[PDB]
Design an enzyme around this catalytic site. Structure first.
Site, PDB file in Angstrom:
ATOM      1  N   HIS A 232       0.860  -1.175   0.000  1.00 21.96           N
ATOM      2  CA  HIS A 232       0.000   0.000   0.000  1.00 21.96           C
ATOM      3  C   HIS A 232       0.911   1.245   0.000  1.00 21.96           C
ATOM      4  CE1 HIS A 232      -3.477   2.514   1.236  1.00 21.96           C
ATOM      5  NE2 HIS A 232      -2.532   3.217   1.835  1.00 21.96           N
ATOM      6  N   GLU A 233       1.861   1.277   0.931  1.00 17.99           N
ATOM      7  CA  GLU A 233       2.782   2.401   1.029  1.00 17.99           C
ATOM      8  C   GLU A 233       3.659   2.475  -0.216  1.00 17.99           C
ATOM      9  OE1 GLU A 233       2.186   4.628   3.352  1.00 17.99           O
ATOM     10  OE2 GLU A 233       0.679   3.189   3.970  1.00 17.99           O
ATOM     11  N   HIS A 236       2.167   4.474  -2.858  1.00 19.88           N
ATOM     12  CA  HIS A 236       2.348   5.903  -2.634  1.00 19.88           C
ATOM     13  C   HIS A 236       3.727   6.309  -3.107  1.00 19.88           C
ATOM     14  CE1 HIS A 236      -1.336   6.838  -0.821  1.00 19.88           C
ATOM     15  NE2 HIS A 236      -1.144   6.164   0.300  1.00 19.88           N
ATOM     16  N   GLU A 270      -5.152   8.823  -1.309  1.00 21.65           N
ATOM     17  CA  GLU A 270      -5.546   7.607  -0.617  1.00 21.65           C
ATOM     18  C   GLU A 270      -6.570   6.789  -1.404  1.00 21.65           C
ATOM     19  OE1 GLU A 270      -4.041   6.287   1.699  1.00 21.65           O
ATOM     20  OE2 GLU A 270      -2.840   7.970   2.462  1.00 21.65           O
ATOM     21  N   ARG A 371     -10.619  -4.927   3.168  1.00 22.63           N
ATOM     22  CA  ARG A 371     -11.904  -4.362   3.534  1.00 22.63           C
ATOM     23  C   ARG A 371     -12.588  -3.790   2.295  1.00 22.63           C
ATOM     24  NH1 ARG A 371      -7.913  -0.859   4.598  1.00 22.63           N
ATOM     25  NH2 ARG A 371      -8.260   1.409   4.557  1.00 22.63           N
TER      26      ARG A 371
HETATM   27 ZN   LIG Z   1      -2.153   5.387   2.199  1.00 21.07          ZN
END
Ligand SMILES: [Zn+2]
Ligand SMILES: [Zn+2]
Length: 426
Positions: A232-233, A236, A270, A371
């Site tokens: 996830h990071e 980014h 995000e 999720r």
């Molecule tokens: Zn994030």
């Protein structure tokens, strides 16, 4: 083929995979930390992210509000044993990511997305390596027996967590220009990206839920896979490397049709990163502004690249780098020899950067439970004390180990099933 290096915190510096690094924000301050090169262009520094903070910030607030979400521990990652363990865990998470073709592709994209050697305020006709936005200093040990200071280019540096242990974050190097903050990672150029990451603490969630009125349980909890939090990071990081980090920007197009836990302002960065239906919460008006803005940054970069005739660093092959950036930015060459933006190629590149890698899709590719939406309640996060034990987590299946029959229905992530894999934070 991408290789993930191996090492112990106690191993000695070798001017290659293990060094004493002066982090970007310590430029000129002569403060070094031991660093390990997990892979090309990616370094890991087993230290707490104390940049722009104070010693007291690591301690809990004045009897916190009833929001058991942010966890603290000033003593986390302070000893050599803690650092080595941290280091072994990151190596395992990187191997897990690399062992899946989709993760391997992510790592590859990141490694090749080198920051441009310059920015909107550097000499347009010269590659510039003298900036903490593209390089960091280090101590090197040389044959004669003398220790000297040198510079090195990189893409990503991963530190341990900041004050809040369970608050992974990615930021690009900030530059001070005309009494203002300038982010090359938002201007198309990209820059060194820094991460504050903690693999031991992960959040919890429950998809099968719909207003638990007159209830208190409604069992269906799952803890997240640290490898997916890392990817996830890393997404980014990818956005920043391409200079497409989305600055603060997000209101409320249509926030209601979603069903999970809540609805509250956030950042487009995000939503893009998470992906799935959440990405559609960003209006086409905003997506078009971002698109047009980045297209303009890239045209300005093509014009600059076309002007480069020299570099301050003698160790840099000008033509070689010109080819690397042509490939990175997907630029074409007109008959005049000028670099230009090809609209179709830009659109394809832009799509791969904003939509090609998302938490939702990677979870799918890795058989990792996720999720429904980025919009969830501050569910009490749990701790994973034994990531180094293959009986609990391995680098090919994570927690969902088939030999333990924990692959089906992501049972390895199910709190009611894999009860020993986690511990409730005290
Ligand atoms: Zn994030
Ligand atoms: Zn719930």
């Amino acid at each position: 083929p991408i290789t993930i290096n191996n090492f112990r915190y106690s191993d000695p510096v070798n001017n290659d995979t293990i060094i004493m690094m002066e982090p970007p924000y310590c430029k000129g301050l002569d403060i070094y930390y031991k660093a390990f090169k997990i892979t090309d262009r990616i370094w890991i520094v087993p230290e707490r992210y104390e940049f722009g903070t104070k010693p007291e910030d690591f301690n809990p607030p004045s009897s916190l509000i009833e929001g058991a979400s942010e966890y603290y521990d000033p003593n986390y990652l302070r000893t050599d044993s803690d650092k080595d363990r941290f280091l072994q865990t990151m190596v395992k998470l990187f191997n897990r990511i690399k062992n899946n073709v989709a993760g391997e592709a992510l790592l590859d994209k990141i490694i090749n997305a080198i920051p441009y050697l310059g920015n909107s305020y550097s000499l347009l006709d010269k590659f510039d390596t003298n900036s903490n936005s593209v390089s960091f200093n280090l101590l090197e040990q040389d044959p004669s027996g003398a220790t000297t200071k040198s510079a090195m280019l990189t893409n990503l540096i991963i530190f341990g967590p900041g004050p809040v242990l369970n608050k992974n974050e990615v930021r690009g190097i900030v530059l001070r220009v005309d009494n203002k903050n300038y982010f090359p990672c938002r201007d198309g150029f990209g820059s060194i990206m820094q991460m504050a990451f903690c693999p031991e603490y992960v959040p919890t969630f429950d998809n099968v839920i719909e207003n638990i009125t007159s209830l208190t349980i409604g069992k269906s909890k799952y803890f997240q896979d640290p490898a997916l939090l890392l990817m996830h990071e890393l997404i980014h990081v990818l956005h920043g490397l391409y200079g497409m980090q989305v600055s603060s920007h997000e209101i409320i197009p249509s926030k209601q049709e979603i069903y999970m836990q809540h609805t509250y302002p956030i950042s487009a960065e995000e939503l893009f990163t998470f992906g799935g239906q959440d990405a559609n919460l960003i209006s086409i008006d905003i997506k078009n502004d971002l698109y047009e803005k980045t297209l303009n940054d890239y045209k300005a970069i093509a014009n600059k690249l076309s002007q480069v005739t020299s570099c301050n660093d003698p160790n840099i092959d000008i033509d070689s780098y010109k080819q690397i950036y042509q490939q990175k930015y997907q630029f074409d060459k007109d008959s005049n020899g000028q670099y230009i933006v090809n609209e179709d190629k830009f659109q394809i590149l832009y799509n791969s950067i904003m939509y090609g890698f998302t938490e939702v899709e990677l979870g799918k590719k890795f058989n990792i439970k996720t999720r429904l939406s980025y919009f969830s309640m501050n569910h009490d996060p749990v701790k994973i004390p034994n990531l180094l034990d293959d009986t609990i987590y391995n680098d090919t299946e994570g927690f969902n180990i088939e030999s333990k029959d924990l692959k089906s229905e992501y049972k390895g992530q199910n709190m009611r099933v894999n009860t020993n894999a986690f511990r409730n934070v005290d």
